[PDB]
Amino acid sequence: MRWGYTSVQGFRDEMEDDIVIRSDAVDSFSYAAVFDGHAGSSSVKFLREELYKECVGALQAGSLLNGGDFAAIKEALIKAFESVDRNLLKWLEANGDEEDESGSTATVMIIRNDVSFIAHIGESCAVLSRSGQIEELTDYHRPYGSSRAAIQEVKRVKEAGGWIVNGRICGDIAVSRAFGDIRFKTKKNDMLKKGVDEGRWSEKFVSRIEFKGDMVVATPDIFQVPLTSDVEFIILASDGLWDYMKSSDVVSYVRDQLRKHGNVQLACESLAQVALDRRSQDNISIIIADLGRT
Amino acid sequence: RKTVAKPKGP
Ligand SMILES: [Mn+2]
Ligand SMILES: [Mn+2]
Structure with missing residues (x-):
């Protein structure tokens, strides 16, 4: 063509x-x-x-x-x-x-x-x-919406122990699948720490978090x-x-x-x-x- | 919309 x-x-x-x-x-x-x-x-x-x-x-x-x-x-x-x-x-x-x-x-x-x-x-x-x-x-x-993928993505993210605010994972990322984005994958725990250090949330908040899997994945x-x-x-x-x-x-x-x-x-x-x-x-x-x- | 943002708790 x-x-x-x-x-x-x-x-x-x-x-x-x-x-x-x-x-x-x-x-x-x-x-x-x-x-x-x-x-x-x-x-x-x-x-x-x-x-x-x-x-x-x-x-x-x-x-x-x-x-x-x-x-x-x-x-x-x-x-x-x-x-x-x-x-x-x-x-x-x-x-x-x-x-x-x-x-x-x-x-x-x-x-x-x-x-x-x-x-x-x-x-x-x-x-x-x-x-x-x-x-x-x-x-x-996307971590919001009604299409087939949407409900399943939100389920998958919540299953991994993440949360969604303003239609973004942890109030940050507006897509649920992507390459890179290490802070949602192999550095998600570090991510929580940085948040405390930068005053986006409290120490006690991080305590209640329990990441089971990667919140963002590259699986197509x-x-x-x-x-x-x-x-x-x-x-x-x-x-x-x-x-x-x-x-x-x-x-x-x-x-x-x-x-x-x-x-x-x-x-x-x-x-x-x-x-x-x-x-x-x-x-x-x-x-x-x-x-x-x- | 900007695809990323400084994170926020619920
Ligand atoms: Mn872009
Ligand atoms: Mn774009």
Whole structure:
């Protein structure tokens, strides 16, 4: 297919989104990812090469992609994500910080021949258009809400002994799954301590806390997305887009652009400008795969 | 919204 992409800072004082698109034409294989970093860019930077390499490795070990073992593909991509996060946390600890507290979300799409898989953590979103109809392919990992993932995430966080205030875990983080974010994982106890030292809560408060598991995890949801000849285009984007434009609206908008000039790169740039005209307040990154059709 | 914030108890 053809790719259109854009990644802009918009109204934020820093740019922490990034995008990756890598193809192997001989193998009919492509990897597209949007990363939405927070509290710095070091996690995003790490993921840029490390996640690709690990995913490619996890799936090549066994020529795994089109074997039809969904379970095995799913397990491979999960272990890839978990492994990368393990390595990131070490890196953040040794090649850092000392005040680097960064993290990043990630929505990855892998296509090989006529199969597509999505590995997703966080609050970017992927959608496609199929015979004129929208399919929303991912669900949000937020510690509040009503979608399938939402109730389960809040349950998982509370189960780990964390709490949620102002729609944030420990009043801090607004996503429940992410790479990095060591203070919610292997340094959560230290986190409580720092809070006392910085006067965000009392000593007796920390006493009543009992962390059982990690509050934030990098374990992805994994989806298999059937590809058919009537899939018109696929869109991966950060929440800088979706928070300000409903997916049914973006799909109609892109369809209109492509009917107009058939240029996916121009469609993508014009879409990002619509998001800015609507005064989205975040970095905005968009990747569109134009598969053509009718 | 800013994705992180200084933490707060319930
Ligand atoms: Mn961000
Ligand atoms: Mn964002």
